[PDB]
């Protein structure tokens, strides 16, 4: 009956809320539950079980991260060189910080490998360039 | 049989069958913690300084005491002007000696401080431990951290409470907690901490796989195949490359402007510079132990010392007869070695224009060099008919070890940090691991392609090795495989491939990360 | 034949199907070390020996040079402990200490784990329900401020490799702050988080304009509450706001004139406190945004 | 407090507009902004469609903007477990009664060999992979009476939408078991809840809309 | 669109004897298949 009481408590506490927050919960609940269940299974009894799958990095997860990064770039929030045009010569509904094993550190935009149409590497340090 | 010959030869030869360092270290540790702890941590700076200064004065080293006073005066000039002026015997010194300083601290902070001091006992923490025991007394408390807006101070100010024994005894918390706004058992605590800490060591390795590492790659464009050598600074802030056009170029690895000590070049905006003066292709470069000096050698037979503060040459060394192929600083940066076409190895010091030691014994040109981590031995390798490695003594100048077994041109040499292992690679793709003391080969690693392995690097603990080859790959090896729980050798942990970029340099940082460099060629 | 089958899985190749277990990748000694460290860390006995075993475990995890293979497991353990034990102050404090010890090891590369580490810290800092009379408030507020400091350090350290970490942390803290419906503790944590993440400029440019409205909106309704608990919460909120404002920097009656102008700008309570501080450069810094 | 709520929402909107320009690409202050501040039967489906796109659009956009607390993950794990347990409990009862690179899905097995052959001869075909997946999805099967089919497809879809409200549908998911409420059949002679409707799905007891409106 | 792939006429017909040398076991191809099968056998024996 305690579960019902907690449900009622949350229902009463829902008087102060925001609709977008409810939408976010509705969107992310399934993936959050899956990840939480896996994590709980891993550390059962506060002992490192030696039978659960190991935590390893994979290429598909990093591909998903790259897709999310390109989506973020389309909003004009950051600059990245992950697009295929730069060099020419499940669908989890959770924020990236829920999957630490798929994140790639960032490079300084001025030091990124970006190529023009011809095939030459563009120099990003326009301040220090001089004309012959 | 060689054993018979050696036994006969041996038989025929009659062979019978001080305080400033500690203060700076403590200050550097203090500013690293969270801003909460720093308020209580700063209280330890003044007592330590005053007691160290008084001890140095009493011991008779008045010069050292004066040096300490003048060096640190700027730090406390804005708080204790009167005390510093007095320190320039009166009853103040007697009162300081009689009454031991009282400093309040929290229990968790005390534990962290004691653990940190124990961790660096031989590095300079023993001095602070002794000073704190003798001239100071800590009244540990279970309260929370004291801050102008923390729970403890707010509670004391709001509820109009009273000071405690620790708060009773020129900055005093009374001015803060008043309306106008325990002891310690060191020594015992130290053995006690050591006993507790000794219980958490790892003493085995069974099963599992190798260590995972990350890698960052720097690529150079539009070189047109004129780059001959590469090198990073010890802190990975600068990169230098020598070319076949006789000049050298240094860059900032982060793109920030480079700085020159010359006043006429005040605040100039450039992130790469050129060092000119060689009249032949440059084959070697070496950053000194930030780096302020640089060495280079070329095919014209000269070694040049450059300055990274004014960007100009300082001295020329003219000991060689023919091309010089490699040049290397010592492990600590006062001695350097060189070797080239005339089949000789020379050791220099930067204070003398002539080589202090000359090492004869090779029969062909030298193609590799390496120093021992202790700075008293050097390694060299020759090519062609005589493919052998030799270990020389810098004190006497004689050879003490020879390693044989290579069948191809030797390209790289490397010595482990522990000082007991040596690595070498050739153009056949092989990597050898040698035992220095016994002069015996331990094992061979395979997997690299033919062409050459220009560089090698050892992990911090000497348990992992990384190599880069001209076949556009970076590979990681396990020196010792894990104990079993009951074309490529099975000890290769990983292998990465580059996009048509031969690797000319690999380096291990403090972490499990490396930095590589190379030149990109579209063809 | 002698090649370990788990190397292909370690390489991350997609064609691989065999999934190694924990027993295949980590050595037995490391497993024993992990279990020992976890057992020592989660001891609730107030006996001095257990506290000291805890301290030794923390020091070992902080200074051991061979824990490269246990970083994901440490992060996941911290996350799980924070997630499933929100009603135990002791466990939260131990998890905060463990997180502090992990990021201070100089032989570990923590760049790709920054957001994962920051999420539990944020949860501990800005959660309505912590633990479960004055001692409880002391513990809760100490935990909140410790979490704020840890978040400050994390943001300062790994803010460059992670491009959007600082803006997101500042936005979350600010959004949680600009909501009168929250209890005083949540607002205290939110203002501390804004000050810790955004920096002095973010404070000066996002909090100062609205302090006048915030005063009459929240502080005065609470100020009329004579309850000692209400008094303590009011004092804590005001002190946190004062510290955040003072973070920007850290002669006759001109100081009085500036203080009165600040009172006009910031508000009665906060303005009076700033005027009482008797600081001229600080007052100039605050008034520099008066037009805004 | 409605006026206060609106005032604070507008204030936060203004502050967020101001903050958006405070950080550069490297997580550092943009001095230009600082100096600037220093200066003195389809129409309803379409209506449902556009609504769902708008809601999800902002939902995904929130990933790159905000953090969220971990104070609700435990409940989600427990809630899903209860639903999974309920699903299995309902299972073992009805079953016995009834007795290339892209992530295409489970259907790909039904065309694995075809998907292999098409790519090898990708020169003859002229569609795009995105269209081909759309073409494959469109042609892939959905699974005496006219209107029975789509009505049932609509009926089960609305039922699933009801299940989508897992935040509130848990108490009434399963029928009122006699053990829980032994007087239910004595008091309520018509046991009918989400469980009852689910039981009826495979037994053909739906004729008109008004029937379910009464339910 | 899809049907263009299967354009080859042999996907649905059964070769007839009357047409001539329509056997799908031409020596010119059987020579290579036998050699490959022999190669696999040797590899299996070495492994075995």
Automatic annotation (TrEMBL), chain B:
It comes from the Eukaryota. Keywords: Initiation factor, Nucleus, Protein biosynthesis, Repeat, Transcription, Transcription regulation, WD repeat. Pfam families: LisH, TFIID_NTD2, WD40. Transmembrane segments: none annotated. PROSITE patterns: LISH (PS50896), WD_REPEATS_1 (PS00678), WD_REPEATS_2 (PS50082), WD_REPEATS_REGION (PS50294). WD repeats lie at residues 220-254, 317-358, 359-402, 403-444, 453-480. SUPFAM superfamilies: Taf5 N-terminal domain-like, WD40 repeat-like. One of its GO terms (biological process) is transcription initiation at RNA polymerase II promoter. Its main location: nucleus. GO terms for molecular function: RNA polymerase II general transcription initiation factor activity; translation initiation factor activity. It is found in: Nucleus. Residues 18-136 form the TFIID subunit TAF5 NTD2 domain. The keyword Nucleus applies. InterPro entries: LisH, TFIID_NTD2, TFIID_NTD2_sf, WD40/YVTN_repeat-like_dom_sf, WD40_PAC1, WD40_repeat_CS, WD40_repeat_dom_sf, WD40_rpt. GO terms for cellular component: transcription factor TFIID complex. Belongs to the WD repeat TAF5 family. This is Transcription initiation factor TFIID subunit-like protein. It comes from Chaetomium thermophilum (strain DSM 1495 / CBS 144.50 / IMI 039719) (Thermochaetoides thermophila). The lineage of its organism: Eukaryota, Fungi, Dikarya, Ascomycota, Pezizomycotina.
Automatic annotation (TrEMBL), chain C:
This is TBP-associated factor 6. The chain holds residues 161 to 479 of 480 of the full protein. Keywords: Initiation factor, Nucleus, Protein biosynthesis, Transcription, Transcription regulation. It comes from Chaetomium thermophilum (strain DSM 1495 / CBS 144.50 / IMI 039719). Belongs to the TAF6 family. GO terms for cellular component: SAGA complex; SLIK (SAGA-like) complex; transcription factor TFIID complex. It is found in: Nucleus. One of its GO terms (molecular function) is translation initiation factor activity. It comes from the Eukaryota. GO terms for biological process: chromatin organization; RNA polymerase II preinitiation complex assembly.
Automatic annotation (TrEMBL), chain D:
Residues 111-138 form a coiled coil. It is found in: Nucleus. It comes from the Eukaryota. Residues 85-96 have a biased composition (Basic and acidic residues). Residues 80-103 are annotated as: Disordered. Residues 164-215 form the Bromo domain. This is SAGA complex subunit Spt7. It comes from Chaetomium thermophilum (strain DSM 1495 / CBS 144.50 / IMI 039719) (Thermochaetoides thermophila). The chain holds residues 60 to 399 of 1196 of the full protein.
Automatic annotation (TrEMBL), chain E:
It comes from the Eukaryota. It comes from Chaetomium thermophilum (strain DSM 1495 / CBS 144.50 / IMI 039719) (Thermochaetoides thermophila). This is Uncharacterized protein. It is found in: Nucleus. Belongs to the NGG1 family. The lineage of its organism: Eukaryota, Fungi, Dikarya, Ascomycota, Pezizomycotina.
């Amino acid at each position: 009956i305690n579960g019902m009481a907690l449900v009622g408590e949350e229902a009463a506490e829902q008087t102060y809320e925001d609709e977008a927050y409810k939408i976010w919960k509705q969107v992310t609940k399934k993936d959050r539950a899956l990840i939480a269940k896996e994590r709980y299974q891993l550390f059962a009894n506060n002992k490192l079980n030696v039978e659960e799958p190991a935590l390893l990095r994979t290429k598909a997860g990093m591909r998903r991260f790259l897709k999310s990064r390109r989506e973020a770039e389309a909003l004009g929030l950051i600059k990245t060189a992950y697009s295929d045009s730069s060099v020419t010569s499940a669908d989890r509904a959770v924020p990236s910080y829920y999957e630490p094993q798929t994140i790639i550190p960032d490079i300084d935009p001025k030091l990124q490998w970006v190529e023009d149409g011809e095939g030459q590497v563009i120099n990003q340090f326009e301040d220090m360039l001089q004309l012959v | 049989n060689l054993n018979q010959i050696v036994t006969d030869y041996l038989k025929k030869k009659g062979f019978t069958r001080k305080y400033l360092k500690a203060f700076l270290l403590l200050k550097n540790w203090i500013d690293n913690n969270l801003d909460i702890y720093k308020f209580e941590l700063r209280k330890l700076l003044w007592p330590v300084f005053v007691y160290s200064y008084l001890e140095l004065v009493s011991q008779g080293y008045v010069d050292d005491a004066k040096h300490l006073l003048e060096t640190l005066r700027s730090h406390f000039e804005a708080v204790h002007q009167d005390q510093l002026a007095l320190l320039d015997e009166n009853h103040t010194t007697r009162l300081y000696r009689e009454n031991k300083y009282r400093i309040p601290l929290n229990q968790s902070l005390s534990g962290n401080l004691f653990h940190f001091l124990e961790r660096e006992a031989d590095n300079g923490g023993a001095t602070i431990i002794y000073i704190l025991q003798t001239h100071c007394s800590v009244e540990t408390s279970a309260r929370g951290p004291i801050e102008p807006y923390s729970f403890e101070a707010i509670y004391r100010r709001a509820r109009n409470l009273d000071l405690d024994e620790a708060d009773a005894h020129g900055v005093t918390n009374r001015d803060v907690l008043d309306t106008s706004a325990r002891a310690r058992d060191v020594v015992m605590e130290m053995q006690k901490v050591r006993e507790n800490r000794d219980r958490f060591v790892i003493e085995g390795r069974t099963g599992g796989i190798g260590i995972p590492v990350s890698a960052c790659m720097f690529t150079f464009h539009n070189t047109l195949g004129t780059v001959s050598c590469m090198d990073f600074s010890n802190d990975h802030k600068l990169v230098a490359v020598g070319t076949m056009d006789s000049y050298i170029r240094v860059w900032s690895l982060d793109g920030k402007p480079l700085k020159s000590a010359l006043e006429n070049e005040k605040n100039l905006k450039v992130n790469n510079r050129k060092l000119i003066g060689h009249s032949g292709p440059v084959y070697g470069v070496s950053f000194s132990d930030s780096s302020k000096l640089l060495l280079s050698c070329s095919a014209d037979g000269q070694i040049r010392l450059w300055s990274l503060e004014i960007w100009a040459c300082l001295c020329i060394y003219k000991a060689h007869d023919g091309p010089v192929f490699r040049v290397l600083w010592g492990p600590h940066g006062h001695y350097f070695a060189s070797a080239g076409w005339d089949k000789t190895v020379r050791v220099f010091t930067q204070d003398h224009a002539s080589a202090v030691r000359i090492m004869v014994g090779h029969d062909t040109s030298i193609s590799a060099l390496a120093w021992h981590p202790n700075g008293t031995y050097v390694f060299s390798a020759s090519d062609e008919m005589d493919k052998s490695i030799r270990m020389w003594s810098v004190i006497t100048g004689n050879c003490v070890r020879i390693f044989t077994g290579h069948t191809h041109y030797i390209t790289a040499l490397e010595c482990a940090h522990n000082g007991k292992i040596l690595a070498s690679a050739d153009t056949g793709g092989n990597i050898f691991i040698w035992d220095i003391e016994k002069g015996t080969l331990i094992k061979k690693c395979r997997g690299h392609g033919k062409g050459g392995i220009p560089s090698l690097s050892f992990s911090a603990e000497s348990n992992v090795l990384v190599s880069g080859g001209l076949d556009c790959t970076v590979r990681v090896w396990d020196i010792e495989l894990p104990a079993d729980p009951n074309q490529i050798t099975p000890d290769q942990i990983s292998a990465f491939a580059t996009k048509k970029t031969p690797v000319l340099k690999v380096r291990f940082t403090r972490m499990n990360l490396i930095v590589a460099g190379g030149c990109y060629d579209p063809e | 034949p002698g090649a370990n089958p788990a190397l292909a899985a370690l390489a991350g190749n997609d064609n691989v199907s065999f999934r190694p277990s924990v027993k295949h990748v980590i050595s037995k000694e490391l497993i024993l070390y992990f279990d020992k460290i976890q057992a020592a860390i989660l001891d609730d006995d107030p006996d001095e020996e257990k506290m000291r075993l805890r301290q030794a475990a923390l020091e070992s995890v902080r200074s051991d040079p061979g824990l490269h293979q246990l970083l994901p497991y440490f992060v996941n353990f911290i996350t799980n402990q924070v997630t499933h034990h929100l009603d135990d102050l002791f466990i939260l404090r131990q998890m905060m200490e463990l997180a502090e010890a992990v990021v201070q090891n100089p032989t570990l590369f923590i760049d790709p784990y920054a957001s994962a580490l920051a999420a539990p810290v944020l949860t501990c800092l800005m959660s309505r329900k912590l633990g479960k009379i004055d001692s409880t408030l002391r513990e809760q507020y100490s935990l909140r401020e410790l979490a704020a400091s840890l978040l400050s350090m994390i943001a300062r350290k790994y803010g460059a490799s992670n491009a959007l970490l600082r803006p997101k942390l500042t936005r979350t803290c600010l959004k949680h702050f600009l909501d009168p419906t929250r209890p005083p503790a949540v607002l205290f944590g939110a203002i501390s988080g804004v000050a810790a993440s955004g920096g002095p400029e973010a404070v000066r440019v996002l909090v100062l304009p609205n302090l006048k409205t915030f005063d009459s909106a929240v502080l005065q309704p609470l100020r009329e509450k004579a309850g000692p608990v209400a008094e303590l919460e009011y004092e804590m909120l005001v002190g946190g706001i004062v510290k955040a404002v003072q973070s920007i920097v850290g002669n006759g009656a001109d100081l009085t004139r500036e203080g009165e102008q600040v009172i006009e700008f910031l508000g009665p309570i906060v303005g009076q406190r700033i005027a009482q501080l008797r600081n001229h450069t600080l007052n100039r810094s605050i008034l520099e945004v008066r037009h805004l | 407090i409605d006026h206060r709520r609106a005032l604070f929402a507008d204030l936060f909107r203004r502050a967020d507009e101001r903050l958006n320009l405070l950080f550069d690409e490297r997580g550092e202050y943009n001095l230009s902004a600082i100096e600037s501040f220093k200066r003195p039967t389809e129409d309803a489906r379409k209506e449902l469609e556009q609504a769902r796109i708008a809601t999800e659009e902002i939902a995904k956009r929130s990933f790159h903007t905000l953090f969220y607390t971990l104070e609700h993950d435990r409940t989600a794990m427990l809630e899903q477990q209860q639903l999974e347990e309920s699903e299995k409990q309902l299972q073992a009862e009805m079953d016995k009664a009834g007795s290339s690179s892209a992530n295409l899905g489970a259907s790909s097995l039904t065309l694995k060999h075809l998907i292999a052959r098409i790519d090898q001869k990708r020169e003859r075909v002229r569609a795009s992979d995105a269209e081909l997946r759309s073409l494959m999805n469109e042609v892939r099967k959905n699974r005496e009476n006219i209107g029975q089919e789509e009505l049932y497809e609509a009926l089960e879809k609305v039922l699933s939408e009801l299940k989508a409200h897992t935040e509130y549908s848990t108490p009434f998911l399963q029928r009122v078991s006699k053990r829980e409420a032994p007087d239910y059949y004595t008091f309520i002679k018509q046991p009918m809840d989400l469980g009852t409707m689910t039981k009826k799905l495979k037994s053909l007891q739906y004729k008109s809309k008004a029937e379910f409106v009464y339910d | 669109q899809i049907g263009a792939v299967f354009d080859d006429e042999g996907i649905t017909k059964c070769p007839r004897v009357e047409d001539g040398d329509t056997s799908i076991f031409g020596r010119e191809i059987m020579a290579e298949l036998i050699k490959r099968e022999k190669e696999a056998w040797d590899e299996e024996v070495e492994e075995e």
